[PDB]
Design a binder for this molecule. Structure first.
Ligand SMILES: Nc1ncnc2c1ncn2[C@@H]1O[C@H](COP(=O)(O)OP(=O)(O)O)[C@@H](O)[C@H]1O
Ligand SMILES: Nc1ncnc2c1ncn2[C@@H]1O[C@H](COP(=O)(O)OP(=O)(O)O)[C@@H](O)[C@H]1O
Ligand SMILES: Nc1ncnc2c1ncn2[C@@H]1O[C@H](COP(=O)(O)OP(=O)(O)O)[C@@H](O)[C@H]1O
Lengths: 496, 496, 496
């Protein structure tokens, strides 16, 4: 199994090529100049590599009193879009080649979901389990400082974020260190980082954001007849049955929402075992179980499978966990017709081939798990707007709505001598519940959905237009390289 | 035959251990807290490693019209002293690790000649021969820009400089780019980088700098009985005889000054051959002959020697060129008693150990080729002062001098009738030729000398203290670790 | 005894009036407009009170893990002159009114010595002796932050300093915290505060400063026939004798320097007891004595003398010490002809009247103890300059000197047929010692003594203009009001 970097690289060179051709001819051959426009495919040669990587070595005083000098790095892939966005990862297993990779992935991912950020990612060679809360904070702060002092943390230059090794606490600090130091005078200092506590300016609905993203990623394709007939789906007996590998945030939620709308979870499988039950498995039962005690292992109304649900017979297989989990090997032996990448790179470029041979719809990481990002965009904005979404409008709207009903009602009662005979002025229970409890989350969620939909379509289209099949991935990376390109091209280089 | 980095790192660790002890006891034992002060040695763990290193990719459109991304990096070793100082190198061999290493050397080298800058170094993976004057420029400039936007160029942050691969022409572009871009509003924009054209704000006497440095460097030890006895030197008959390896800038000047003061140059080898002549060689002659034609090859009044001049018989051997020229191999076969490192790292750690074992004094890169830097500091200051050293005082002092003389003359004529009898009022020829041709260069040269001398003693003292002998190099690394440490200590780290 | 506030306020109001008149008629009645110029004495109404005063309550987390708020202030008296200057006091008994008063003094004191800074002062209601080194640091840093966020610390705004209750360790932190936060980009961030360690950018000669000041103050006057006659001094038998309350910093150096030049110390006190001996006491010997063990008490070659030495028959009494030590009480009983205020407000107002009636020449704190301040202003520049005074000239000068001698020589020789018969070329032993050991302190000391002089002369003149006598104080306060007024006057207010 190749390393994340070789993979992305590949992916990019793949979609690069594909593009090239088209990218010149029916996209800009009305003003052709010595067809030395083919030569402008240098742009893509620029777009490939990370423009800036900062590596650091900064001390901290451990509680005990002894000094230690921590290493870390943050890589900014592309600044085609001014604020670079990307998380920070605290783990002994970080490498400047990894962060370069993952930064690479972000730049493209964003483009996919039309989030105006450049890819970037950081990593600190540290194991959080070996440091005290106190120590951690010391580290993150001093990381924020150097990061800022050289241009790799600013609300206009590079807005970091958490990764499954870091949390809101850290972000919060990052935000606060910045705001009370370098960014003392920036009226948007709290925009420097996203994924922060609501108290510290976070945005409601961050949690469920990646999860819901998955959901809408699958949904949008499931509901297309054209793809759901090259598979033989969108049923009328079994409806839909899925499987999730990885009961960590994303998974959970993905199970929660996928189940809240028909589908029936039939397997779940963490980094400690599995579960199985071709009758179904409730989200709010398994959740609670996972919470009350240790793992999901030994859960009633379910029988313990051995290994990794990846093969379990179902319609929708969702890999919401570790890297490379679907390889050349097991690739053929997967009974699912739909693979939803609820995690970065959970399928190899060997596995792709395969799933492609045997009509398998692989819904990209590069798209499916970009729900978090999409909301992180919003968080940013929120910060810039200095107001919770809706704070001014929810009441106005609510009124506008009762008027618009009340008008119906009046006008209809004018076609019958009465003054209260008809009653349109009543919203549908669900509507009343919506308006009653209108909150930021809602707007977000919506904004989320709308992005995911409009992006799916984009993907589709840019798949049909290059006649790729179920090669949703390369369709995507292509779609992205086009975008990123367009920007670079409509300007220049040092003659931008 | 190690590598520049293992070397320096070794040199540090060496001097770091030699100091630890006496860095606690006798330097701060009359305040002692739990003797957990020996745990403060973590200041040295902090020093060791470059704190920041930026690595970038950046395009340029060659003159044919094709695009090409270029790769480079700048590493700032320390920030103990605010404006990091260090050169830029343009060569296809540059490696992060090399830069990191050189940077490392600059911090220490600066401490050695009390120059307030922190070690830095840059390198662009390019081969200037393959680019046109117009492309090179393009390249520098964009380099500057990115280097600026991320805090690696700035009159108060990092101040680059040339290297054997780069020249005042580039430095002048760096400057202007900077001035006219990010530094448009800085009243000291031109201080962003030294080693630039007089026209652009250079400092008279930049050229001869490094060379003169090397000359004094030697001189100051060659005039100290003590050392010159260990060797059996400061002779009556032969006086002194020396050879230089590398007729580049530094090697040329060295030979020029060393000669002007007695010393006979017997051999001089370049990259393309050598020259020999136990009668002597004249600098001007062998200078004009290296200018009128190509190389120094086929020079009259001098037979051609085969190979290096490193083994020629002579008193003073001076390596003014490539890296690791003196290794464990040829070490034992050198006839010279004094090796003056007129370049960085031209002697391996193994070679040192030999040289010591056979009583050979090796005047450390760290110190000897620190002339350049020394004069760069001045340049910097020259720019801050916004005036050419002496512009205001020259004439005033000249006057003050004739008024001195004039008084002696009146006061000596009032011990003898007359009113013009005795004439002291006349300056010695020399004097008159130094007053009449006063210039910035003279102030820079003197300031240079003073710093070499003062340092020299410093070294000498720190060698005798730690009973070293002719290990002038580890004295000096010690002397530097001990300066860099003080600063750090006299503040702290996060609580600095 | 009144409070420092109501005293200064008084001293101002006294000079203020004494100026008003003359500060119209012979200093501007050429242009005269309506004679409503008398109404422009509102400038002094402005000059009297402190423009701004920041109070603040910050927290720190005491080693033991608790949480406590600290209170502190910083009052900027005037800004007539850009960078406010003034120290930081750490003590439970600091009151806004006190700093305010003290700030007020600085702004005139500076004027006196021609030091371009406005008067400021800060206090922190804290007793060091109750905090650990660590805790102190936390406190002095937070302070620096909050002080910088609101414009009360800044190299061009307000440059703090140390005060009896603080040291260079703290000033070093204050500097560092600024330079690493808010002032990250200021290429003069270490000019934010003075008094700091050499290793942190301090100036050489800061600890002999206030002492050498005192000296020069007294020396300047003692060598002025005029005064020295109204007294009856500048003797031929008993040359000069002196006493010095207080043996602290300033007293000690005072004694040292005055001694070194002929005077004979004939009594030294201290907050324990006193000494005595009409044959003379050596500075070195007492100094060491003080050091070796506890306090000056029980010093050989001298007999204890109950009380204070303020009465002890001398020639020159020096009050280096505590406040209000010479009151209406003892004031007539004082054998001394000249009182040199080594500290702030030693004498009362009452006492002044008396010493005036009985022809005493009190040299005002406002001037006498301004030597510290003066240097200080150099330390500031030092930072702002980025080079140790003399670093480029020492050698150049050395040389020029020798050339000077050498010409005198040669010239003289050419009035006698021999090439080495006359030997001027040899400095005086002193001269050679000054040339050999040149250093920054020399330039600093010089500069101090030229400020002292020039300002003594100014005070005199200003006292013979307003026919004041041996009222040196007011004469000073006046000299200062004048200065500070002229700045204001030659601009305006809102239309300044
Ligand atoms: N990461 C990206 N890289 C390049 N282009 C992008 C990226 N994200 C968004 N874009 C482009 O920005 C353009 C202008 O924004 P617009 O379409 O008006 O708003 P929205 O991006 O929210 O749909 C869009 O045409 C979109 O294709
Ligand atoms: N690179 C350095 N690291 C640590 N200390 C240094 C360094 N360079 C100079 N110093 C120290 O800075 C101190 C303060 O400067 P000073 O001695 O007044 O001027 P100069 O350094 O030109 O002699 C000196 O005592 C010197 O030892
Ligand atoms: N604090 C002050 N307030 C008002 N005037 C001042 C102050 N300090 C200095 N001055 C004035 O500034 C003027 C201009 O400076 P100058 O005399 O050339 O240099 P220097 O002040 O070092 O003697 C002087 O005439 C001096 O009287």
């Amino acid at each position: 199994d190749p390393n994340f970097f070789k993979m992305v690289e590949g992916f990019f060179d793949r979609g690069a090529s594909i593009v090239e051709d088209k990218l010149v001819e029916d996209l800009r051959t009305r003003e052709s100049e010595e067809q030395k426009r083919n030569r402008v495919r240098g742009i893509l040669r620029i777009i490939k590599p990370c423009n800036h990587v900062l590596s650091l070595s900064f001390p901290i005083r451990r509680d005990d009193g002894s000094w230690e000098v921590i290493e870390g790095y943050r890589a900014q892939h592309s600044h085609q879009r001014t604020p670079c966005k990307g998380g920070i990862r605290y783990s002994t297993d970080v490498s400047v080649d990894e962060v370069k990779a993952l930064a690479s992935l972000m730049t493209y991912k964003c483009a996919v979901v039309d989030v105006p950020f450049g890819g970037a990612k950081a990593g600190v060679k540290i194991n959080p389990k070996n440091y005290t809360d106190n120590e951690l904070e010391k580290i993150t702060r001093r990381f924020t400082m150097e990061l800022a002092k050289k241009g790799f943390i600013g609300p206009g230059i590079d807005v970091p974020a958490p990764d499954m090794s870091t949390g809101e606490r850290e972000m919060s600090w990052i935000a606060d260190t910045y705001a009370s130091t370098i960014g003392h005078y920036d009226i948007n200092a709290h925009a420097c980082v996203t994924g922060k506590p609501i108290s510290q300016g976070g945005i409601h609905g961050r949690i469920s954001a990646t999860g819901r993203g998955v959901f809408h990623g699958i949904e949008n394709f499931i509901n297309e007849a054209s793809y759901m007939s090259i598979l033989g789906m969108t049923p009328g007996f079994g409806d839909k049955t899925f499987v999730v590998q990885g009961f960590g945030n994303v998974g959970l939620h993905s199970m929660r929402y996928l189940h809240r709308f028909g589908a029936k979870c039939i397997a779940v499988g963490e980094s400690d075992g599995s579960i199985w039950n071709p009758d179904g498995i409730d989200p709010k039962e398994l959740e609670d179980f996972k919470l009350q005690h240790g793992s999901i292992l030994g859960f009633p109304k379910a029988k313990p499978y051995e290994g990794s649900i990846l093969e379990a017979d179902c319609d929708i297989l969702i890999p919401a966990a570790s890297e490379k989990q679907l390889t050349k090997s097991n690739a053929p032996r997967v009974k699912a017709k739909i693979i939803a990448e609820g995690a970065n790179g959970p399928t190899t470029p060997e596995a792709d081939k395969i799933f492609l041979e045997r009509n398998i719809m692989v819904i990209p990481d590069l798209y499916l798990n970009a729900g978090g990002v999409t909301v992180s965009y919003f968080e940013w904005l929120k910060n810039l707007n200095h107001v919770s979404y809706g704070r001014l409008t929810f009441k106005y709207e609510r009124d506008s709505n009762y008027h618009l009903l009340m008008s119906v009602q009046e006008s209809l009662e004018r076609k019958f001598g009465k003054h209260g005979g008809t009653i349109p002025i009543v919203p549908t229970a669900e509507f009343q519940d919506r308006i009653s409890g209108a909150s930021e989350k809602d707007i977000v969620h919506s904004g989320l959905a709308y992005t995911m939909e409009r992006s799916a379509r984009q993907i589709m289209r840019t798949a049909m237009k290059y006649n790729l099949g179920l090669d949703l991935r390369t369709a995507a990376y292509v779609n992205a390289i086009e975008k990123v390109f367009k920007v670079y091209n409509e300007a220049g280089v040092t003659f931008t």
